[PDB]
Amino acid sequence: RIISSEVQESNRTETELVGLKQNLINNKLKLMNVLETGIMYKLEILQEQL
Amino acid sequence: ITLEKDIKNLKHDINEKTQINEKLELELSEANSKFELSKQENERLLVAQR
């Protein structure tokens, strides 16, 4: 009972938190995609044109 | 929490660089307009001289 409701339940919450961590990392990678290859690339081309 | 703060900080960076890019695009359009106006005005003045 302690495992299923306290230990393994805490481990399930930990797995959900790790999944949230991976989702946040993926969102961060998307932001670097929009930023580096994007808004910095857009900044570079805009500065070149200007 | 650290990754969420990183995402938020990178979103303010996105917003700042997006304001910069909006200013750059406004300045690019303004430079194009200033070219067309100024070169046409110089053409008009040189044509009056001619």
From Swiss-Prot, chain A:
It is found in: Nucleus; Chromosome, Centromere, Kinetochore. Disulfide bonds: none annotated. Transmembrane segments: none annotated. Changing residue 39 to K: Temperature-sensitive. It comes from the Eukaryota. Component of the NDC80 complex, which consists of TID3/NDC80, NUF2, SPC24 and SPC25. The NDC80 complex is formed by two subcomplexes, TID3/NDC80-NUF2 and SPC24-SPC25, which are joined end-to-end through their coiled-coil domains. It has a rod-like structure with a length of 570 Angstroms and globular domains at either end. The TID3/NDC80-NUF2 globular domains are probably directed to microtubules, the SPC24-SPC25 globular domains to the centromere. Present with 1550 molecules/cell in log phase SD medium. Belongs to the NUF2 family. Acts as a component of the essential kinetochore-associated NDC80 complex, which is involved in chromosome segregation and spindle checkpoint activity. This is Kinetochore protein NUF2. The chain holds residues 302 to 351 of 451 of the full protein.
From Swiss-Prot, chain B:
It is found in: Nucleus; Chromosome, Centromere, Kinetochore. Disulfide bonds: none annotated. Signal peptide: none annotated. It comes from the Eukaryota. Belongs to the NDC80/HEC1 family. Present with 1160 molecules/cell in log phase SD medium. Component of the NDC80 complex, which consists of NDC80, NUF2, SPC24 and SPC25. The NDC80 complex is formed by two subcomplexes, NDC80-NUF2 and SPC24-SPC25, which are joined end-to-end through their coiled-coil domains. It has a rod-like structure with a length of 570 Angstroms and globular domains at either end. The NDC80-NUF2 globular domains are probably directed to microtubules, the SPC24-SPC25 globular domains to the centromere. NDC80 probably interacts with SMC1 and SMC2. Also interacts with KIN3. Interacts with DMC1. Acts as a component of the essential kinetochore-associated NDC80 complex, which is involved in chromosome segregation and spindle checkpoint activity. This is Kinetochore protein NDC80. The lineage of its organism: Eukaryota, Fungi, Dikarya, Ascomycota, Saccharomycotina. The gene is NDC80.
